[PDB]
Design a protein around this ligand. Sequence first.
Ligand SMILES: *[C@@H]1O[C@H](CO)[C@@H](O[C@@H]2O[C@H](CO)[C@@H](O)[C@H](O)[C@@H]2O)[C@H](O)[C@H]1NC(C)=O
Ligand SMILES: *[C@@H]1O[C@H](CO)[C@@H](O[C@@H]2O[C@H](CO)[C@@H](O)[C@H](O)[C@@H]2O)[C@H](O)[C@H]1NC(C)=O
Ligand SMILES: *[C@@H]1O[C@H](CO)[C@@H](O[C@@H]2O[C@H](CO)[C@@H](O)[C@H](O)[C@@H]2O)[C@H](O)[C@H]1NC(C)=O
Ligand SMILES: *[C@@H]1O[C@H](CO)[C@@H](O[C@@H]2O[C@H](CO)[C@@H](O)[C@H](O)[C@@H]2O)[C@H](O)[C@H]1NC(C)=O
Ligand SMILES: *[C@@H]1O[C@H](CO)[C@@H](O[C@@H]2O[C@H](CO)[C@@H](O)[C@H](O)[C@@H]2O)[C@H](O)[C@H]1NC(C)=O
Ligand SMILES: *[C@@H]1O[C@H](CO)[C@@H](O)[C@H](O)[C@H]1NC(C)=O
Ligand SMILES: *[C@@H]1O[C@H](CO)[C@@H](O)[C@H](O)[C@H]1NC(C)=O
Ligand SMILES: *[C@@H]1O[C@H](CO)[C@@H](O)[C@H](O)[C@H]1NC(C)=O
Ligand SMILES: *[C@@H]1O[C@H](CO)[C@@H](O)[C@H](O)[C@H]1NC(C)=O
Ligand SMILES: *[C@@H]1O[C@H](CO)[C@@H](O)[C@H](O)[C@H]1NC(C)=O
Ligand SMILES: *[C@@H]1O[C@H](CO)[C@@H](O)[C@H](O)[C@H]1NC(C)=O
Ligand SMILES: *[C@@H]1O[C@H](CO)[C@@H](O)[C@H](O)[C@H]1NC(C)=O
Ligand SMILES: *[C@@H]1O[C@H](CO)[C@@H](O)[C@H](O)[C@H]1NC(C)=O
Ligand SMILES: *[C@@H]1O[C@H](CO)[C@@H](O)[C@H](O)[C@H]1NC(C)=O
Ligand SMILES: *[C@@H]1O[C@H](CO)[C@@H](O)[C@H](O)[C@H]1NC(C)=O
Lengths: 182, 338, 177, 48, 343
Amino acid sequence: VKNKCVNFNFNGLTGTGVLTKSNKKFLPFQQFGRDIVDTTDAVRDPQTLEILDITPCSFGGVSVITPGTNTSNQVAVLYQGVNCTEVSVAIHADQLTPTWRVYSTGSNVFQTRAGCLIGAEYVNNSYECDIPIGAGICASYQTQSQSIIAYTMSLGAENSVAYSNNSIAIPTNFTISVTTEI
Amino acid sequence: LPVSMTKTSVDCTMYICGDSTECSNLLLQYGSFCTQLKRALTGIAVEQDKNTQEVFAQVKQIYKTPPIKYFGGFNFSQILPDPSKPSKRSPIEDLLFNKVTLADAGFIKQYGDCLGDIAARDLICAQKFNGLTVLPPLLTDEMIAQYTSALLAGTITSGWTFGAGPALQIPFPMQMAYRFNGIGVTQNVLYENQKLIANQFNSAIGKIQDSLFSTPSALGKLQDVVNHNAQALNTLVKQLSSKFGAISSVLNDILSRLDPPEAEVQIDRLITGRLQSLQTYVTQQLIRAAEIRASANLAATKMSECVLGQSKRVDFCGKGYHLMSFPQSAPHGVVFLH
Amino acid sequence: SKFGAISSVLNDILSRLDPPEAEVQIDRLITGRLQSLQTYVTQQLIRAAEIRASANLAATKMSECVLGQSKRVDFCGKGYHLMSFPQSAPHGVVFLHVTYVPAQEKNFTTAPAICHDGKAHFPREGVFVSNGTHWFVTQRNFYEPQIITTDNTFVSGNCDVVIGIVNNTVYDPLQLE
Amino acid sequence: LPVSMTKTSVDCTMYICGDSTECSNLLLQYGSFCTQLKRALTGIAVEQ
Amino acid sequence: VLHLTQDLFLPFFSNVTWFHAIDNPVLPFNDGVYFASTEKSNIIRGWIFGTTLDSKTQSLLIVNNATNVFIKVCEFQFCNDGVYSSANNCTFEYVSQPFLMDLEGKQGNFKNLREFVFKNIDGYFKIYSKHTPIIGRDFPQGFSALEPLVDLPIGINITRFQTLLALNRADYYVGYLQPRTFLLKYNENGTITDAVDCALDPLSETKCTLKSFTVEKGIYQTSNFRVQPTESIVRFPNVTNLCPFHEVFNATRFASVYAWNRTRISNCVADYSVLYNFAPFFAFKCYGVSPTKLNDLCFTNVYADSFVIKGNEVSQIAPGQTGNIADYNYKLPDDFTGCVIAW
Ligand SMILES: *[C@@H]1O[C@H](CO)[C@@H](O[C@@H]2O[C@H](CO)[C@@H](O)[C@H](O)[C@@H]2O)[C@H](O)[C@H]1NC(C)=O
Ligand SMILES: *[C@@H]1O[C@H](CO)[C@@H](O[C@@H]2O[C@H](CO)[C@@H](O)[C@H](O)[C@@H]2O)[C@H](O)[C@H]1NC(C)=O
Ligand SMILES: *[C@@H]1O[C@H](CO)[C@@H](O[C@@H]2O[C@H](CO)[C@@H](O)[C@H](O)[C@@H]2O)[C@H](O)[C@H]1NC(C)=O
Ligand SMILES: *[C@@H]1O[C@H](CO)[C@@H](O[C@@H]2O[C@H](CO)[C@@H](O)[C@H](O)[C@@H]2O)[C@H](O)[C@H]1NC(C)=O
Ligand SMILES: *[C@@H]1O[C@H](CO)[C@@H](O[C@@H]2O[C@H](CO)[C@@H](O)[C@H](O)[C@@H]2O)[C@H](O)[C@H]1NC(C)=O
Ligand SMILES: *[C@@H]1O[C@H](CO)[C@@H](O)[C@H](O)[C@H]1NC(C)=O
Ligand SMILES: *[C@@H]1O[C@H](CO)[C@@H](O)[C@H](O)[C@H]1NC(C)=O
Ligand SMILES: *[C@@H]1O[C@H](CO)[C@@H](O)[C@H](O)[C@H]1NC(C)=O
Ligand SMILES: *[C@@H]1O[C@H](CO)[C@@H](O)[C@H](O)[C@H]1NC(C)=O
Ligand SMILES: *[C@@H]1O[C@H](CO)[C@@H](O)[C@H](O)[C@H]1NC(C)=O
Ligand SMILES: *[C@@H]1O[C@H](CO)[C@@H](O)[C@H](O)[C@H]1NC(C)=O
Ligand SMILES: *[C@@H]1O[C@H](CO)[C@@H](O)[C@H](O)[C@H]1NC(C)=O
Ligand SMILES: *[C@@H]1O[C@H](CO)[C@@H](O)[C@H](O)[C@H]1NC(C)=O
Ligand SMILES: *[C@@H]1O[C@H](CO)[C@@H](O)[C@H](O)[C@H]1NC(C)=O
Ligand SMILES: *[C@@H]1O[C@H](CO)[C@@H](O)[C@H](O)[C@H]1NC(C)=O
């Protein structure tokens, strides 16, 4: 059963992960496989004499972004650093360790460089960052009638200077500002 | 000056007890000795994000250079963003990005090709195996170059006015006149030897590119930061290979071989070893984070003083009587052009 | 936290077991509590170093912006620093940076130098600024147009090498009297 | 103003196992634990 | 306080089966069963528990009456309706104040709602109750803690559940408990004003990991997600290397007991199905190892001593035995780690 998270007990080497075909160069006497950090990487099939690779199962980390509970109860779920199709099939097969299930409408799907975001919808507009998610993506609570929206952070107002060969601007007036700093 | 380093979110639970219910139960007896580590690591990530934000996002308005680039004979193509390049980076920025090699990029989503590694799996797949992941930074290497571009465009088309108030355009010639006046030489010499100073500046700009190209390692500070982080990560991963004084270094082997009440001592020994190793890693990461925070504060104040105006303190903005500085983005750091 | 021992309460565990076999659990409790304390003290040292750096920065900012005026830009608040008034805060300090910031600006004109008669005139301080018809001089950070006199300018040049030079006349109070 | 403090190169084997082969062997069971300390002290000396 | 605990609780917004009355299906009991019933005066009497509900395994009977209770750990025979017909192996008679108390303000609209929860962790039967004339429509929404009444260490086998009704001339609310981690808000008087799950909603999990009831705007790292593997493969080498057990069982001249042939077996995989299928045994007594557990142990060396003998001599041959064979022909060591086969 390849290309599936499966508990393996190969010749006494027991572990968890996904196994598939490989293009290793195992010598005939070779039985196990490893890497620089001494973690079992490849195993030879004792009854097939083929080479299989060992992978983490689905490792990631769930982070929840939310506004104040006194404001709203709606929440959004981040699955850190996982392709968002993999969580989709795992949810549909009901093999995810998290038992809480955030509903998937198809419009709340977001493949982000930081992972897959569920429960928020993409708006192609640009706003100032409110809740940092990562990879230049920020979410906030915004009315449509209210929901959680995800957008690329606006670096600021787009402004262009009036540089020229012989044109200058001199302030004819001035203001007094009292800032604060802690 | 380095600005930040990779953000990690080690999870002690299955870093120490790989999918072992009894090991998790044993770990539960050690109290909240894990929440401390998770909170410390997430705090370190937050401070690093804050460091890069302080050291770069200094101007609220993003500016762009005028389409024509003739600033009184001065040449800025080597530092201005390249429209032909799809990443919109300076030629020097390209050299900085190519002379730095990151073992762990972070924004890779490398799951799905570890099974397809064919050869021996690499460092990142190894980390993914045993409960260690890298959290990608908020400010992508892309728009940060946009920030540096905005800062550079502000400092050559408006002098230093835009750092105190509204951006007021000043042509580059009398801007240099004022930078000469701020050090103690009258603008007349610049207005006589404009051609000579322009040629000298162009020659220096051209030579610094060759200096960065031909040097063995001038970006050694950023490379050292990356190498130290990778080495700490590698030794943390390798520490799971130590029996720590028990029968074997494989928790699952110990579980499947001995009874619970006798393998209990061995798994407790493994917990005491692995958790303490994670403690050393976390403390060392804290020290490195404090050091890089101090360096990033220094970089922020250096940028605010030298780049956004003329600094009167000697040797602070490079050796000699300072005139101006030009910022350039680097992997996990910044590069200055005094 | 039991720390892998019989119980987490010392007075009970000594009152539940005799010494010669209880000392194992006592040692386990000792090492658990000692490791927790070591982690706490290390974190406290880290926090103390960070707060020491912050306090040194605060002291420097205090001695700069309050006991005088600092020319370091974006140090004593955004904009041109004027003063700063400290305020007491719980376990901290509060500054009130008073900063001069410009306002409404207008395009007028500029000239790097003005040539009256074969000689280039440069402003002693400020910009040679033209309304659009008449050339004038003023400061950098405020628009105070003034008549171009020989007191506002110093002459040194030959009126042939200044790129972008402009034509006009300069005034002097000595020829009239 | 202080500038530097006394550079140290503590040695794991000599410090914790005085010339004892079995002690060193059982130390080796702890993995590369103290190599980190040796690297840290070397880095401290270089920094100073 | 905002104490957190882990124990078998009824999940929030879980599924509760609602029944009626006017037969008495026996619902399974596993990891506890939640109960509730609202009534005017009374229609329910007691509960019976246990496995197969007959006079063979110890069971339970909790009938309540007008003044007291009748809890008893008994092994009653059958009633199929005077509710028991056997008290031979029955002990633990317990009587106390009735669980149900009814209060009515001169009108029956105050339907007394009674909430019961039972569990059998390491024996120690526990009963939970809080009685109030709640709104009375049905299973309500407002929070309500549960007051323990009796903690009794039964310590018997328990598998099925049933309840006993009353006579006459809307209830039955049944839920199940699962191991979950919860938060409980304690009032300054000590009451539980509100409680939160940690395995129901992402927001609830955040309130758990950041233990509180108010969460500020922001991002919080709560836990990790891992896909549990679906199937488990066990793979071992293609080696078969069948032992000579066939050759020691298919022989035709099994030696006499006086000259017992001792065969040395090495370098083979000891599959015991080959001995299982070859002989209809009559004595497969094992001493050092379990007869079921022979295929999961690796042995340094195996001796197969075969000799045909009489019938009673089969029982004679055993460790620490005596007899004309056990003393002069073959004597089994007292520390015999092995099995004998007689067919
Ligand atoms: C510079 O800007 C000031 C405000 O920042 C102006 O002061 C204002 O004056 C008006 C009346 O003219 C008041 O109504 C207002 O409250 C404020 O005091 C000031 O006039 C202006 N001066 C110039 C020359 O632009
Ligand atoms: C500014 O400096 C540029 C250096 O990158 C000059 O580009 C050069 O272009 C020539 C061909 O046009 C190349 O052969 C050379 O390698 C370099 O890329 C650019 O001309 C220059 N412009 C001005 C106005 O000085
Ligand atoms: C050039 O600068 C002159 C300042 O002296 C402005 O001239 C003014 O014109 C008025 C009449 O319109 C006079 O009464 C006054 O004394 C002054 O000379 C003039 O507006 C300005 N030109 C432009 C285009 O800004
Ligand atoms: C400023 O005015 C000068 C005369 O006062 C001009 O000088 C003249 O330049 C012309 C050629 O442009 C010569 O033919 C003539 O002999 C005299 O030298 C000067 O050009 C002028 N410059 C500008 C920028 O207006
Ligand atoms: C805890 O219990 C106290 C003792 O009954 C309560 O105080 C009482 O409050 C009532 C009003 O509800 C007063 O009339 C009475 O005199 C006494 O002060 C207290 O409210 C209660 N706290 C709770 C339930 O939160
Ligand atoms: C394993 O044994 C079976 C049974 O004889 C045989 O069909 C198969 O080819 C063998 N495979 C290997 C790799 O030895
Ligand atoms: C991950 O990203 C997408 C979405 O799943 C798809 O191309 C594939 O699964 C992965 N691709 C890469 C390059 O990792
Ligand atoms: C609007 O958003 C969609 C995706 O949500 C994107 O493809 C499109 O380019 C956006 N439009 C603009 C004008 O940015
Ligand atoms: C400035 O002058 C140069 C040369 O005199 C010319 O190439 C350029 O187009 C001019 N730009 C402006 C804005 O006047
Ligand atoms: C100067 O002129 C440019 C030309 O478009 C204009 O954009 C800018 O706003 C002007 N600045 C002023 C009037 O201060
Ligand atoms: C409870 O069960 C019913 C019917 O089986 C189903 O419709 C409902 O969705 C279930 N509720 C939950 C919370 O699972
Ligand atoms: C009710 O049960 C108790 C249990 O001891 C018993 O004593 C009593 O006789 C029963 N009947 C009444 C009417 O109380
Ligand atoms: C009670 O147990 C005894 C054995 O101790 C048994 O003989 C008897 O049949 C049991 N009573 C029943 C099953 O009613
Ligand atoms: C002996 O071997 C034959 C051939 O496999 C088999 O049919 C028979 O049942 C065996 N008899 C015994 C006693 O093992
Ligand atoms: C053991 O020896 C006896 C001697 O008579 C023989 O009959 C029997 O077949 C032997 N069993 C073996 C070789 O397995």
